[PDB]
Amino acid sequence: QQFELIDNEFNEVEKQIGNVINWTRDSITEVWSYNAELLVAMENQHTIDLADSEM
Amino acid sequence: QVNGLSGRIDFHWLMLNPNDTVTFSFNGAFIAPDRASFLRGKSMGIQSGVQVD
Numbered sequence: 001q002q003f004e005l006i007d008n009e010f011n012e013v014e015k016q017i018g019n020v021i022n023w024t025r026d027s028i029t030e031v032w033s034y035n036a037e038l039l040v041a042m043e044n045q046h047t048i049d050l051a052d053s054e055m
Numbered sequence: 056q057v058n059g060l061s062g063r064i065d066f067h068w069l070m071l072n073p074n075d076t077v078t079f080s081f082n083g084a085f086i087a088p089d090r091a092s093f094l095r096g097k098s099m100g101i102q103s104g105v106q107v108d
Contacts, residue, residue: 009102 007013007021057063064086071077071091079085 004100005102 007018012018013021066086069077079087
């Protein structure tokens, strides 16, 4: 889960390719947000259905 | 005219694998290198203006 930079803030890369980079990064961000909420959700559901089963 | 001088010096670079040769044939207008660089280990690069701690 480490990662370096591909773009840079100071000397902005060419406008078009930079736009593509922002687009791709935002797409991956939406993917990972979905995965995070889903993983949390079913970890919770499993926790609940687990606890009252041990009961 | 950047800062007074209209002439430019551009830089080119290559990574030369071990036991390989690089050949500079030239005629002038060549900014020669004195030393070559060898990366030491691993590091992490960031960009910021905030203070160190």
